[PDB]
């Protein structure tokens, strides 16, 4: 009878068209920590992609240490944290041996799936992201060529020792077949297929995932993505983002999505140039991050920073 | 009451275009092997752990592994002062979780007013700070020297102190008349960065760092650990290691214990012919060498020919 919070894809330190989202990401984490006080969850899982790069800025590392500190030290919520494809494993893994004392777990090794973490009588199976090279070389299997082959092979390590009488939840970072895609995700593959099938996770009672930034990328009773904390591309402009709440109520699993409201959103406006700089066009919020696809090709003086006096946080201009 | 005194690791240090991390991992390995022998009460690292404020992934992993063996595997308390070279936020990352295993990281110079006491000995922490940073905390224009800011620092703890107790100061600065090395940076912007030994007269002992010669200062109360390795050909032939401090009912005794490196820095003189025919005395052919030779004629690439027989040659000078 526990309450589990499922988030993923923080992508701290991300830059969109030369603009830093750290001012925004600090705001959305303020709201994340604020509503976690009201929930008082039994555990939080962060299903990968915490940093946008393998070389996070001094300011971005501060942000993670501060947010994770409030959640785990002063709110005293246990945390499970796996790595993603963007993540720098060792930069994320730093100091993990001291963190385990206060129930803060970090996993950057797909080998760790054989070692599940048990919180509130629930078994969490962690499987950080791994490429197929580094997967096929641990198993020494040369017939591992697609992401699914290596992922299924990882689960056959743990399938015989798994406990069927408890609640087994898999935390991973991968692409499920049939999920919608945004342009804030990098491809995991070269010319192979990166998607894993639904039947791979038949053993697990539940699957908490991250990689696809759309929260409703996969509609399923057993498998579900958290989605990104914010809109990280204009493909997701306007769509709601946030976190997911999962409650196991005496063997009855229920999941719901809770939206978060950002400091500003991403919006796309099409129309005439003189309609938008003369403010004869409707905009939901003129402080938004904006992509302008406009008319009148000839642009007297600078086209864009004439628009920046009206709309300060404009990012791209297409014509 | 046995204390280990070390400083100036400068992890990630580059010397003449080569990373010294392979050497530093060997000397840190030998340091904790000698920490298994000497069962110590405290290990003190008086600053300058990294070489820049943005260390590489491998350098960060080395500090985590080394510190981990000391604090966790061997259950040794550690105190970490911030030096003039390393970044304060990268050094204190996760310091809140580390205090539960008695691992103390101080990067704030205003932290001197809250000493750490273990085994009946009080440790006052004075991480490095600049006069522009020290000027703003006290809102004083009196302090334009580095010495006055330190005097200002100790005056905070001067009323709040027990002269009865063993009071040790850990800091990172320059003492008057101390010997210099070329791998050290200037601490101020073109003034006098040195401090007289009278400022530290309220303390029973001063453990310092910044000056890489173990015997920079010859004084009973103020001593320098010195750098882990020779980080410049100015330090060629200098013994390096750590200081051991033993206390028994108020009487302090100090020793210097040297670590023998995998490689040394030698400056070799002679002629190209004798040197390449191995008839000039070289301690170890594997050592890092700077050659001042005199055969300025017949050799195609004199460095490559030299590297054939002396692999770790670093610099060549001809006369
Ligand atoms: Mn992602
Ligand atoms: Mn991803
Ligand atoms: Mn220094
Ligand atoms: Mn130094």
Swiss-Prot record, chain A:
GO BP terms: namely: DNA recombination; DNA replication
| GO terms, molecular function | 3'-5' exonuclease activity; endonuclease activity
| Source organism, top-level taxon | Bacteria
Sorted keywords for this record are:
DNA recombination, DNA replication, Endonuclease, Exonuclease, Hydrolase, Nuclease
Q: What family does this belong to?
A: Belongs to the SbcD family.
Instruction: Say what the protein does.
Output: SbcCD cleaves DNA hairpin structures. These structures can inhibit DNA replication and are intermediates in certain DNA recombination reactions. The complex acts as a 3'->5' double strand exonuclease that can open hairpins. It also has a 5' single-strand endonuclease activity.
Q: What is said about its interaction partners and assembly?
A: Heterodimer of SbcC and SbcD.
Protein name per UniProt: Nuclease SbcCD subunit D
List the source organism. Answer: Staphylococcus aureus (strain Mu50 / ATCC 700699)
Parent protein range shown? 2 to 318 of 373
Swiss-Prot record, chain B:
From the UniProt annotation, give the residues forming the signal peptide.
none
Asked if RNA-binding is a keyword of the record, the answer is no
SUPFAM superfamilies cross-referenced by the UniProt entry: Metallo-dependent phosphatases
GO molecular function, a single term: 3'-5' exonuclease activity
The record's keywords, sorted A to Z, are: DNA recombination, DNA replication, Endonuclease, Exonuclease, Hydrolase, Nuclease
Which Pfam family, giving just one, matches this sequence?
Answer: SbcD_C
The reply to whether Hydrolase figures as a keyword in the UniProt entry is yes
Q: Name one GO biological process term.
A: DNA recombination
Q: Which CDD domains match?
A: MPP_Mre11_N (cd00840)
Cited function: SbcCD cleaves DNA hairpin structures. These structures can inhibit DNA replication and are intermediates in certain DNA recombination reactions. The complex acts as a 3'->5' double strand exonuclease that can open hairpins. It also has a 5' single-strand endonuclease activity.
Q: What quaternary structure, including any partners, is listed in this protein's UniProt entry?
A: Heterodimer of SbcC and SbcD.
Q: What is this protein called?
A: Nuclease SbcCD subunit D
Please state the gene responsible for encoding this protein.
sbcD
């Amino acid at each position: 009878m526990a309450k589990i919070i499922h988030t993923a894809d923080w992508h701290l330190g991300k830059i969109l068209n030369g603009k830093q989202l750290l001012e925004d990401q600090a705001y959305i984490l303020d709201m994340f920590v604020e509503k976690m006080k009201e929930e008082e969850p039994d555990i939080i899982v962060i299903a990968g992609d915490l940093y946008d790069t393998t070389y996070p800025s001094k300011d971005a590392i501060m942000l993670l240490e501060q947010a994770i500190g409030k959640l785990n030290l002063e709110l005293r919520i246990p945390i499970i944290m796996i790595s993603g494809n963007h993540d720098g494993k060792e930069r994320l893994n730093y100091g993990a041996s001291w963190f385990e004392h206060n129930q803060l777990f970090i996993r950057t090794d797909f080998t760790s799936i054989n070692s599940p973490i048990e919180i509130n009588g629930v078994n969490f199976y962690t499987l950080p992201y791994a490429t197929v090279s580094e997967m096929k070389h641990y198993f020494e299997d040369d017939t591992i060529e697609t992401h699914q082959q290596g992922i299924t092979r990882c689960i056959e390590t743990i399938a015989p020792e798994i406990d069927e009488d408890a609640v087994n939840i898999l935390i991973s970072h991968l692409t499920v077949q049939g999920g919608k895609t945004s342009d804030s995700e990098r491809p995991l593959t070269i010319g192979t297929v990166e998607s894993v099938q639904k039947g791979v996770f038949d053993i697990f009672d539940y699957v908490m995932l991250g990689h696809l930034h759309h929260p409703f990328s996969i509609e399923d009773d057993k498998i579900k993505y958290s989605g990104s904390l914010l809109q990280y591309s204009f493909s997701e402009a306007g769509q709601a983002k946030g976190y997911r709440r999962l409650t196991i109520n005496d063997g009855i699993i229920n999941d719901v999505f809770i939206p978060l409201k950002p400091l500003r959103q991403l919006e796309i406006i099409s129309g005439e140039y003189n309609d938008v700089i003369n403010e004869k066009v409707h905009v939901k919020n003129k402080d938004n991050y904006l992509h302008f696809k406009l008319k009148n090709m000839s642009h007297i003086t600078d086209p864009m920073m004439s628009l920046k006096q009206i709309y300060p946080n404009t990012l791209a201009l297409t014509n």
